[PDB]
Design a protein around this ligand. Structure first.
Ligand code: CA
Ligand code: CA
Ligand code: CA
Ligand code: CA
Ligand code: ZN
Lengths: 154, 75, 71, 155
DNA sequence: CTGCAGGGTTTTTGTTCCAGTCTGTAGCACTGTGTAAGACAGGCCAGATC
DNA sequence: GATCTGGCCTGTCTTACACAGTGCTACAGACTGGAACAAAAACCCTGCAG
């Protein structure tokens, strides 16, 4: 929430710990291990019936959006760099997040729990735009650091 | 070339006289000058009327022993 | 009148530096076991100045700049 | 007391009133000319100093001996610009390393080929010898080239 | 009554080796692979000359 | 219209300048258990001291 970079974090961490006799923040490695429970590809799930032509695996994370582009030079090149998620897994992440809120909301509405297990419906918004010719540092020559199109949902 | 001439002709004289060379390395200022690089990015004002003033302030602040001592904090 | 620059009064800089090291200088005087009340008028502090530039900075008058420091 | 050390050469010259940087007078300490520093290389007394540099500049300006241009350069040992900032007579520690590094780099680039067998090689041979030098420095030691050599590349 | 050299005490304080197990921190790779001024030697050539 | 020359070109040589800082990760560096140790710290306690 404050762009704070790892080197910084470790520095100020050692600083405050050796400063006043206590462990106020947590060190990196453990913070990150704890983090691994928030990115996509950490929760089990199921799908009934099974998805159509979608890998049954569930534990994957940050994938490459080329989608196995046969790198053979002759054909259209495969230099375009991209990163994305198995959409379904991104969903199950965001939903497992908002779990807390949906449970408290079932508590306000007083609706039963062993009877609200099925009839649910989530509405999904999406959007996609691109940023022009982004500026960056140490790029006097082109490293295609200009265009980016960020496809997203909420 | 120059430095070659210095080191093959003039090292012993100064090393004899002024205690130590390399002790007076210019290395510090140039090497550290990348701080002037980063400070301009992060903590700028920004307007060159002030850009210097606040950069210099942050720099000298980062430079005194006192805060470095408090940064060590019992090793 | 076309230059942007900032600086100190050199002397004020030096006195800041020395009054800053006050702790370490007193600690060292204690370490050398010398008297601390008398023999307090004859210290000699040697301090090196230095100056080098910084070229072609993407400015937000040319791009380069010169920095002047001491230690 | 003040010790003025931390300057690269160019600055020292331009602020001691010399002729930067590769002209006849080279030693910021000894009055030796360029070429004579090749046959002899060791015994060279340190002379360059601030007060006498002011004196030599005054001798240049007045020219009390009414000499011609180049004898005037010589008798003053070529001190034309009036120095303004004091200097302590010594050299940086880093750029000695840097110049030595680039000189050894070039001497390797040259000893790859044959220069005492071929006295005046051409430019393309220099590019190729550099290329095979980079191949040798990369295959072993796992070292990549740069535009200009910082301290770490030198070390 | 005084001065010290050296008994005892119990107390640190360290002392030994082999399994960890956490850690910070010093490795990894990773862009780019060309510039700027100024001095000097030699060829040489515009150009006045007699 | 040759002649010689000041000066201008070009090629080469020397000193300068950006290349951090950012995530991953492995390693060595730190922590412990019984045995047993020696080495000093400080009171108490005694002698050999006048
Ligand atoms: Ca748009
Ligand atoms: Ca837009
Ligand atoms: Ca420098
Ligand atoms: Ca530099
Ligand atoms: Zn010399």
């Amino acid at each position: 929430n404050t762009f704070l970079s790892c080197s910084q974090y470790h520095k100020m961490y050692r600083t405050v710990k050796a400063t006043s006799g206590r462990q106020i923040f947590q060190p990196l490695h453990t913070l990150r291990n704890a983090e691994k429970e928030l990115l996509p590809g950490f929760h089990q799930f199921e799908w009934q019936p099974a998805l159509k032509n979608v890998s049954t695996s569930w534990d994957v994370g940050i994938i490459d959006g080329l989608s196995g582009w046969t790198v053979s030079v002759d054909d259209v090149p495969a230099d375009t760099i991209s990163r994305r998620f198995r959409y379904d897994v991104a969903l199950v992440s965001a939903l497992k997040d908002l779990e807390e809120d949906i449970m408290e909301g079932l508590r306000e509405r007083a609706l039963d729990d062993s009877m609200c297990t099925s009839g649910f419906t989530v509405v999904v918004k999406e959007s996609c735009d691109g940023m022009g010719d982004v500026s960056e540092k140490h790029g006097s020559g082109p490293a295609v650091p200009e265009k980016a199109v960020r496809f997203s949902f909420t | 070339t120059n430095y070659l001439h210095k080191t093959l002709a003039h090292v012993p004289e100064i090393v004899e006289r002024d205690g130590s060379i390399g002790a007076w390395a210019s290395e510090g200022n140039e090497s550290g000058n990348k701080l002037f690089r980063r400070f301009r990015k992060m903590n700028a004002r920004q307007s060159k009327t002030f850009e210097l003033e606040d950069i210099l302030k942050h720099h000298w602040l980062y430079t005194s022993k006192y805060l470095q001592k408090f940064m060590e904090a019992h090793k | 009148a076309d230059t942007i620059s900032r600086r100190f009064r050199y002397d004020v800089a030096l006195v800041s530096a020395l009054k800053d090291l006050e702790e370490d200088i007193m600690e060292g005087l204690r370490e050398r076991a010398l008297d601390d009340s008398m023999c307090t008028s004859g210290f000699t502090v040697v301090v090196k100045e230095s100056c080098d530039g910084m070229g072609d900075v993407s400015e937000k008058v040319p791009e380069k700049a010169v920095r002047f420091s001491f230690t | 007391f003040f010790r003025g050390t931390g300057y690269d050469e160019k600055m020292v010259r331009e602020m001691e009133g010399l002729e930067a940087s590769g002209s006849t007078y080279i030693c910021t300490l000894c009055d030796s000319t360029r070429a004579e520093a090749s046959q002899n290389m060791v015994l060279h007394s340190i002379t360059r100093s601030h007060d006498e540099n002011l004196e030599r500049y005054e001798i240049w300006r007045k020219n009390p001996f009414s000499e011609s241009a180049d004898e005037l350069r010589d008798r003053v040992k070529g001190v034309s610009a009036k120095p303004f900032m004091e200097t302590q007579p010594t050299l940086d520690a880093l750029h000695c390393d840097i110049g030595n590094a680039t000189e050894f780099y070039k001497i390797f680039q040259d000893e790859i080929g044959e220069v005492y067998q071929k006295p005046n090689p051409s430019r393309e041979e220099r590019r190729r010898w550099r290329s095979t030098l980079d191949k040798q420095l990369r295959k072993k030691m796992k070292l990549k080239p740069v535009m200009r050599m910082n301290g770490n590349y030198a070390r």
